[PDB]
Write a protein that binds this ligand. Structure first.
Ligand SMILES: CNCc1cc([N+](=O)[O-])ccc1Cl
Ligand SMILES: [Cl-]
Ligand SMILES: [Cl-]
Ligand SMILES: [Cl-]
Ligand SMILES: [Cl-]
Ligand SMILES: [Mg+2]
Ligand SMILES: [Mg+2]
Ligand SMILES: [Mg+2]
Lengths: 142, 131
């Protein structure tokens, strides 16, 4: 993309994805590298790459979920919870981000918020495997 | 929008009574048919305090009125995730208008199965009867 196109996207609130600024295959490569860093415990680098990905397309559920995960690892629990809520909203009937928000709320010493998150999963998810995990946390809340 | 602002704010990183006042001013505009003014005030609220279900619901309503159904549905889902079933009911309406009737049906069924609002349940059933 030409500089005028990128500046227009910044000014108009458009994604860089919307103007095809980086080819699709290269973005897939970047996501794959981001995941490799993550799996290898290279958290700082993974964080750079997931921030890059979310700047490129701030509506991509998996890009957002990767950054949220990184923030949870780095104990930035409120920012992780904030991104998980967005990821839930942009996704397709997946309550896993809400489950992870429950974990974050426990770490923020907000157990009633946590309970509400795990209950949202238990009451509405069709994923019984995810429900088992959410129920495990709920059963441990005092 | 509100969502992209929330995501950008996370990448990079007024008292309650007065915020309540500004919400009421937004609703005052809305009730008088000043939808554009109402929208600005709700957008302001959702930039200042995005993770507030009442501000989200008000802005989503405006997008639905303006036939920006996907943006409305996205905001209704944030309101649902943050903690009644009115967001799910309105998401169902949005999905119908988006020509996604199986998505709509799932929303209305969720309302009927979980809501304690008997009037919302009747409304959801009337949509289900038509899908
Ligand atoms: C499962 C699980 C549950 C809890 N809990 O607090 O209930 C903590 C960790 C794990 Cl791995
Ligand atoms: Cl954790
Ligand atoms: Cl709490
Ligand atoms: Cl938005
Ligand atoms: Cl559908
Ligand atoms: Mg491709
Ligand atoms: Mg057991
Ligand atoms: Mg009522």
């Amino acid at each position: 993309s030409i500089s005028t196109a990128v500046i227009d996207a910044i000014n108009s609130g458009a994604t860089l994805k919307d103007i095809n600024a980086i080819p699709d295959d290269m973005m897939d490569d970047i996501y794959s590298y981001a995941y490799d860093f993550y799996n290898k415990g290279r958290i700082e680098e993974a964080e750079v790459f997931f921030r890059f990905l979310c700047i490129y397309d701030f509506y991509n559920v998996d890009y957002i979920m990767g950054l949220a995960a990184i923030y949870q690892i780095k104990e930035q629990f409120q920012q992780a919870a904030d991104l998980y809520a967005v990821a839930f909203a942009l996704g397709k009937n997946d309550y896993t981000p809400v489950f992870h928000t429950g974990q974050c709320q426990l770490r923020l010493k907000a157990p009633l918020k946590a309970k509400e998150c795990f209950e949202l999963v238990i009451q509405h998810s069709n994923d019984e495997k995810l429900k088992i995990k959410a129920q495990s946390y709920l059963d441990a809340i005092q």
